[PDB]
Amino acid sequence: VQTDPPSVPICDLYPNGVFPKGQECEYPPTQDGRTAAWRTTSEEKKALDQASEEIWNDFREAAEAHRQVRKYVMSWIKPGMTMIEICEKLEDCSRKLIKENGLNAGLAFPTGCSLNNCAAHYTPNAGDTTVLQYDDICKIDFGTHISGRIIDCAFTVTFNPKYDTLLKAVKDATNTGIKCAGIDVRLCDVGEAIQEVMESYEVEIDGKTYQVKPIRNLNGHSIGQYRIHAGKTVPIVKGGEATRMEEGEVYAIETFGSTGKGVVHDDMECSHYMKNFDVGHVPIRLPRTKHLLNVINENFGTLAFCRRWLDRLGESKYLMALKNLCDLGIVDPYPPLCDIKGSYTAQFEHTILLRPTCKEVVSRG
Ligand SMILES: O=C1CCc2cc(N3CC[C@](O)(C(=O)NCc4cc(F)cc(Cl)c4)C3=O)ccc2N1
Ligand SMILES: [Mn+2]
Ligand SMILES: [Mn+2]
């Protein structure tokens, strides 16, 4: 049985090594109208699904850890806490439930806790005194993995009911994206459907009215092994690419709603970094730079990391070494992504498996 607060690894809760499936859906019908039900009973589709069973089992173990962490977070996240306090309490729980073991199991990327106008990629660095406020809109976005099978799942936290319709708009747009997704579906069609649903909402916040805008330069994405962004884009506005989703792919279906411009730009101090997946072996003689790259290669590989995690590993005076890795193109910085000052942004996200037999919303219980 899981403790209160959670501390027992998901691995210990399932002695047989079989982790719970997420929500399973039949794929959407074709434009002509023929159903995709045939996939469930097809012997060919079953064998193929069975061929990838260990992979789905890893995503499910990571998803069960993600669900237990987020239910724990919802129970205590309150204004007055520092953003550092929130991230450390969440990560401590995630490390325990995932049974962190180097590159074999762990945290897939830093805990985003972006506030208000900032939509993504904010996590505090050491010394950040930011405190969560009653009127804040906080996007908790964190990831877990087993053998690099990543669960990318996020939700928005508020305390003031004035944002309730804004959150409902974004939740409905995310559920629309999940519903529209499937093998052979055009990525632009998903984007147009998401936008249609999000833009049907009007909200009133402190006497000002807004039509909920999707953040046009943010999007959902394909997921690869140890690769958070695998190359395919799931837009959240019309005008996108008519490229299609394929069998066996994994996607993060995420949407962002804004009362601002519906466009984000890099802002604030950078906390998130990640090795460029396409960069091969680069010999480094510069000793501090060489050491930091070895620390990154050992602890994170191609998974995203943050400055707090380098501090936790006992690294110090590494900022110039980190800038060098960025200048060399080995590491890429991912600074906070913000809409205009005074705007409010919300996000909801789930991970889906485009299995040969069905569509599994693996991060949804
Ligand atoms: O064109 C773009 C550029 C910005 C962008 C951002 C995103 N977001 C926003 C939050 C997100 O869900 C997440 O959890 N990110 C963790 C993460 C940490 C890193 F250090 C590096 C990377 Cl790649 C990802 C995600 O994927 C999604 C699409 C786009 N499209
Ligand atoms: Mn995310
Ligand atoms: Mn994502």
- Per the listing, tokens 């039900």 go with 37
CB-based contact 98:107 (threshold 8 Å): yes
In terms of C-beta density within 10 A (0-12 exposed, 13-18 middle, 19 or more buried), how is residue 85 classed? middle
Assign residue 82 a region: left if phi > 0, alpha if psi is -120 to 50, beta otherwise? Answer: beta
Report the C-alpha gap between 331 and 11 in whole angstroms: 32
For residue 350, say whether it is annotated as part of any ligand binding site. Answer: no
Task: Write the residue with the smallest CA distance to atom 23 of ligand 1.
Answer: 229
Instruction: Fill in the amino acid letter for 283.
Output: P
3-class SS of residue 296: helix
Sign of CA dihedral 89, 94, 100, 103: negative
Active site residue ranges: 141, 152, 221, 229, 254, 349
- Picking from 214, 191, 190, 212, the residue whose alpha carbon sits closest to that of residue 202 is 212
Report the C-alpha gap between 55 and 165 in whole angstroms: 37
Q: What distance in angstroms lies between residue 82's CA and the mean position of ligand 1's atoms?
A: 23
Task: Write the residue with the smallest CA distance to atom 10 of ligand 1.
Answer: 120
Residue 156's DSSP bridge partners are: 139
**Angle value at C-alpha 26, between 21 and 32, nearest 5 degrees:** 160
Report the C-alpha gap between 277 and 303 in whole angstroms: 9
Tally of CB atoms within 10 A around 101: 11
Report the C-alpha gap between 21 and 196 in whole angstroms: 30
Work out whether strand 345-354 and strand 272-275 pair parallel, antiparallel, or are unpaired. Answer: unpaired
> Does ligand 1 have an atom closer than 6 angstroms to the CB of 27?
no
Query: Which regions of 159-243 does DSSP assign to beta strands (E)?
Result: 202-205, 208-211, 213-214, 220-223, 233-234
Query: Which regions of the chain does DSSP assign to beta strands (E)?
Result: 23-25, 105-115, 118-120, 138-146, 149-157, 202-205, 208-211, 213-214, 220-223, 233-234, 250-258, 265-266, 272-275, 305-306, 331-334, 337-338, 345-354, 359-361
**Ligand 1 mutation target, pool 113, 142, 144, 219, most atoms within 8 A of CB:** 219
- Picking from 284, 23, 207, the residue whose alpha carbon sits closest to that of residue 297 is 284
Residue 18's DSSP bridge partners are: none
Q: What distance in angstroms lies between residue 290's CA and the mean position of ligand 3's atoms?
A: 30
Q: Would you list the DSSP string of 38-97?
A: HHHH-HHHHHHHHHTHHHHHHHHHHHHHHHHHHHHHHHH--TTSBHHHHHHHHHHHHHHH
CB-based contact 220:252 (threshold 8 Å): yes
Sign of CA dihedral 14, 16, 17, 23: negative
Report the C-alpha gap between 255 and 171 in whole angstroms: 8
Domain 262-341 bears CATH identifier 1.20.1440.230: no
Each domain of the chain, given as residue ranges in start order, spans 54-261+342-364, 262-341
Q: CA-CA distances (angstroms) from residue 3 to 7, 12, 91?
A: 6, 12, 17
Atom in ligand 1 nearest the alpha carbon of residue 337: 4
Q: What distance in angstroms lies between residue 34's CA and the mean position of ligand 1's atoms?
A: 35
Technique that determined the structure: X-ray
> Does ligand 1 have an atom closer than 6 angstroms to the CB of 67?
no
**Angle value at C-alpha 113, between 293 and 24, nearest 5 degrees:** 95
Name residues with Cβ closer than 5 Å to ligand 3, which is an ion. Answer: 152, 252, 254
Q: What distance in angstroms lies between residue 141's CA and the mean position of ligand 2's atoms?
A: 5
> Does ligand 1 have an atom closer than 6 angstroms to the CB of 120?
yes
> Does ligand 1 have an atom closer than 6 angstroms to the CB of 219?
yes
- Picking from 84, 94, 90, the residue whose alpha carbon sits closest to that of residue 130 is 84
Entry resolution (Å): 1.8
Architecture of the domain made up of 54-261+342-364? Alpha-Beta Complex (3.90)
Q: CA-CA distances (angstroms) from residue 339 to 98, 115, 120, 176, 189?
A: 33, 11, 10, 23, 25
Q: Quote the tokens at residue 343.
A: 């705007």
